[model samples]
Target: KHLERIGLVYHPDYNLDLGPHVFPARKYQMVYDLVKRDSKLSNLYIYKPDLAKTKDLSLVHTQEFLDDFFSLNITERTQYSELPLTKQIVHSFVLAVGGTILSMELAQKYKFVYHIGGGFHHSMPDRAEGFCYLNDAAIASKLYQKEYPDKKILFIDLDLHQGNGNSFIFQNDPDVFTFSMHQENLYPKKEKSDLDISLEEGIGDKEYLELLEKSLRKIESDFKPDLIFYIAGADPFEGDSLGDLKLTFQGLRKRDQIVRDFAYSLNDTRVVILPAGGYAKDFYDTVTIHYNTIKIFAAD
Candidate 1:
């Protein structure tokens, strides 16, 4: 498929299995299929990204972490990652980094790019956590800053859980601003972000959207960014087993549009989106939520 569109990034390896895991490994391919079959978006180009090089991985991750990961030290690997360490899973993580990087590059031309698989924000420089094996967002952000020193980057993480890894990684860096709005009582709550909005349990759509709108306004006014990476996690939906929030499908759609409009309105701003965590009791619910997000953004 020699499709020329520039915004969508995907790869078959994104859905690689890693034994029996709570994380929905197949959702990536499911979302891709949904986009491909949609009559309105079927013609949109689907770009497959090559695995990221070790050097690219090194941009954000530490040498020791890389060594342990490549060596398949299962005991040390699963210690922080909370995920079963396997070669196949490692390959998937590498491909996810590639997808995120490709999405960033595509955003340079399309102004808005969406990767069907990515947003591994829980992985840190030396360790992984919360089902994340690689910090794809951090790697892409670091690479973007390296290539364009003058460009300011912003990360907006709306996952049910905070983007602790990214917050820690970019804490001292002034060029990249990280903002996370998540449930107050979630996993790994010890970390602090550049701007963290902790919401109460069972918060509804209205409050969630309102908070996001205000946060975007403040971020734009205070720290102007040349590029924005949006982590649109489907786990925020009420149906999610892990999410305590009560956002419905309609609310999530509005959340995506709000971010999209804000980014597009900025001065030559580029936006890259990644589908983060989503673990609903009904498996298809997660797929539906993610599909809705892409469908809204991809609409002409």
Candidate 2:
């Protein structure tokens, strides 16, 4: 139970329950609650972030999108925003954006940080998609890059679906390299990433890990990044309702380890992790997957 505390980015606003269909909304609070009760993670230093200011959001989101987000009309609310937008949900979005900003800051101090929620990869500068209201990664990357111009940032999105918005935002931007390994025929597959590795349905742990290893090796040899934003999604599990890939709980743990080890192997690379997507038919299964990722990465 005694260990150096790890920075855990979270906020109470993160879990505003939308409905049974959107039960994942409550997972952030549940993860934090469970972590609180565990002696293994007793040393975690929870950092609560404030709601993102308009100026911070405007960094990546368009002015019109920000306007609509603050005051979305009836039809405008549900138009392509997979989850219905309630006022509380919108509040959660701003807070999540702030959480990513805090995660980036803590990653610089601790060399590792995990946000209990966030990874709204389908959100674009102009609109939302796939239940994502805001692209936290994009906003944080923009702000982070602005603060540190000389740093080379890498975005590693392991979500079941490709990080379409992230790829779109950073497309052709050499300072930021986006690498997404996701299911081949998933939602919003049209966006282009700097490096996109698509896997067929029913792909198992071995093949998945091999592909990941190859990608990591190539990135290591080429990019030499200074900071990394890891979208450690739990949806690749076999039990997930939407994910087509079949990585087991153990496989997911190893996946985190590979990324963790690779990032730490570099000279001065820091990493920030976000739980992107995980809609397991059993909600607890999704929670356990994220818990394992945090536990493994936080452990000494």
Taking all chains together, each candidate's TM-score versus the true structure is 0.95, 0.96
- The C-alpha lDDT values of all candidates are 0.85, 0.86
lDDT of 1: 0.85
Instruction: Estimate, for each residue in 15-114, the C-alpha lDDT of model 1 and write its tens digit.
Output: 8665567788899999888888889877777889999999999998888888888878854645778787788888999999999998988876776788
Candidate 2 backbone collisions, by pair? none
Q: What is the number of backbone collisions in each predicted candidate, taken in the order shown? A: 0, 0
Q: For model 1, which pairs clash?
A: none
Q: For model 2, how does the per-residue alpha-carbon lDDT over 184-239 read when each residue is reduced to its tens digit?
A: 88798568888889889999999999999999988767788888999999999999
Question: How far is 238's C-alpha from truth in model 1 (Å)?
Answer: 0.5
Q: What is the alpha-carbon lDDT of model 2 when measured against the actual structure?
A: 0.86
lDDT, residue 32, model 2? 86
